[PDB]
């Protein structure tokens, strides 16, 4: 598989790594979201150390207002991070 | 960098590989779009061999109606493909 295919599956994989830790095996609750960011986005995003920031990032990604981030919402987050990385380097 | 970071940069990279071939170095025209799909999505999407399909896929991804696929529109395409791959395997 190509780099683009590898990327598509990596997005699926990281999501399930964190979402399947507690509660709804298919949604990132706040503590799963935090660890995903801290462990997996350490070169693109500042480490998250304050509850306020956990709350705020979820508030921002949670489009359907259920207090968790599901797969669709996670894809929106990846697009945001990707767009930011893109614009940074031109 | 983590698998998720690797994926984010791979998305940027493949885009520029194809968009910078002709015309607007930052948008995928139809022929660039076709080659990206054919060469880079061969395990997820059927090979594109008919002009009609090239036209239709662009018609579908082109949200701002400029006849090309820009970075934002490409990110929307990746999310579609990713969501389809996700749902396929559960
Ligand atoms: Ca969960
Ligand atoms: Ca939600
Ligand atoms: Ca181009
Ligand atoms: Ca367009
Ligand atoms: Zn799933
Ligand atoms: Zn660019």
Curated annotation (Swiss-Prot), chains A, B:
<dbReference type="GO" id="GO:0045666">
    <property type="term" value="P:positive regulation of neuron differentiation"/>
</dbReference>
<dbReference type="GO" id="GO:0048143">
    <property type="term" value="P:astrocyte activation"/>
</dbReference>
<keyword id="KW-0130">Cell adhesion</keyword>
<dbReference type="GO" id="GO:0050786">
    <property type="term" value="F:RAGE receptor binding"/>
</dbReference>
<dbReference type="GO" id="GO:0001726">
    <property type="term" value="C:ruffle"/>
</dbReference>
<dbReference type="GO" id="GO:0048168">
    <property type="term" value="P:regulation of neuronal synaptic plasticity"/>
</dbReference>
<dbReference type="GO" id="GO:0097490">
    <property type="term" value="P:sympathetic neuron projection extension"/>
</dbReference>
<keyword id="KW-0964">Secreted</keyword>
<keyword id="KW-0479">Metal-binding</keyword>
<dbReference type="GO" id="GO:0008284">
    <property type="term" value="P:positive regulation of cell population proliferation"/>
</dbReference>
<dbReference type="GO" id="GO:1990845">
    <property type="term" value="P:adaptive thermogenesis"/>
</dbReference>
<dbReference type="InterPro" id="IPR011992">
    <property type="entry name" value="EF-hand-dom_pair"/>
</dbReference>
<dbReference type="GO" id="GO:0007611">
    <property type="term" value="P:learning or memory"/>
</dbReference>
<dbReference type="GO" id="GO:0071638">
    <property type="term" value="P:negative regulation of monocyte chemotactic protein-1 production"/>
</dbReference>
<dbReference type="GO" id="GO:0048156">
    <property type="term" value="F:tau protein binding"/>
</dbReference>
<dbReference type="GO" id="GO:0007155">
    <property type="term" value="P:cell adhesion"/>
</dbReference>
<keyword id="KW-0677">Repeat</keyword>
<feature type="binding site">
    <location>
        <position position="73"/>
    </location>
    <ligand>
        <name>Ca(2+) 2</name>
    </ligand>
</feature>
<keyword id="KW-0106">Calcium</keyword>
<dbReference type="GO" id="GO:0005737">
    <property type="term" value="C:cytoplasm"/>
</dbReference>
<dbReference type="InterPro" id="IPR013787">
    <property type="entry name" value="S100_Ca-bd_sub"/>
</dbReference>
<dbReference type="Pfam" id="PF00036">
    <property type="entry name" value="EF-hand_1"/>
</dbReference>
<dbReference type="GO" id="GO:0042803">
    <property type="term" value="F:protein homodimerization activity"/>
</dbReference>
<dbReference type="GO" id="GO:0036064">
    <property type="term" value="C:ciliary basal body"/>
</dbReference>
<feature type="domain" description="EF-hand 2">
    <location>
        <begin position="49"/>
        <end position="84"/>
    </location>
</feature>
<dbReference type="GO" id="GO:0019210">
    <property type="term" value="F:kinase inhibitor activity"/>
</dbReference>
<dbReference type="GO" id="GO:0044548">
    <property type="term" value="F:S100 protein binding"/>
</dbReference>
<feature type="modified residue" description="N-acetylserine">
    <location>
        <position position="2"/>
    </location>
</feature>
<keyword id="KW-0007">Acetylation</keyword>
<dbReference type="GO" id="GO:0016310">
    <property type="term" value="P:phosphorylation"/>
</dbReference>
<dbReference type="GO" id="GO:0005829">
    <property type="term" value="C:cytosol"/>
</dbReference>
<dbReference type="InterPro" id="IPR002048">
    <property type="entry name" value="EF_hand_dom"/>
</dbReference>
<feature type="binding site">
    <location>
        <position position="68"/>
    </location>
    <ligand>
        <name>Ca(2+) 2</name>
    </ligand>
</feature>
<dbReference type="GO" id="GO:0043025">
    <property type="term" value="C:neuronal cell body"/>
</dbReference>
<dbReference type="GO" id="GO:0006417">
    <property type="term" value="P:regulation of translation"/>
</dbReference>
<dbReference type="Pfam" id="PF01023">
    <property type="entry name" value="S_100"/>
</dbReference>
<dbReference type="GO" id="GO:0005509">
    <property type="term" value="F:calcium ion binding"/>
</dbReference>
<feature type="binding site">
    <location>
        <position position="22"/>
    </location>
    <ligand>
        <name>Ca(2+) 1</name>
    </ligand>
</feature>
<feature type="binding site">
    <location>
        <position position="64"/>
    </location>
    <ligand>
        <name>Ca(2+) 2</name>
    </ligand>
</feature>
<feature type="binding site">
    <location>
        <position position="62"/>
    </location>
    <ligand>
        <name>Ca(2+) 2</name>
    </ligand>
</feature>
<keyword id="KW-0862">Zinc</keyword>
<dbReference type="GO" id="GO:0005576">
    <property type="term" value="C:extracellular region"/>
</dbReference>
């Amino acid at each position: 598989m190509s780099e683009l295919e590898k990327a598509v599956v990596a997005l699926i994989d990281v999501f399930h790594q964190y979402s399947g830790r507690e509660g709804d095996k298919h949604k990132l609750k706040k503590s799963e979201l935090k660890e995903l960011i801290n462990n997996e986005l350490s070169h693109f995003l500042e480490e998250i150390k304050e509850q306020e920031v956990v709350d705020k990032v979820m508030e921002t990604l949670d489009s359907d207002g259920d207090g968790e981030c599901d797969f669709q919402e996670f894809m929106a987050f990846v697009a945001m991070i990707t767009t930011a990385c893109h614009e940074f380097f031109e």
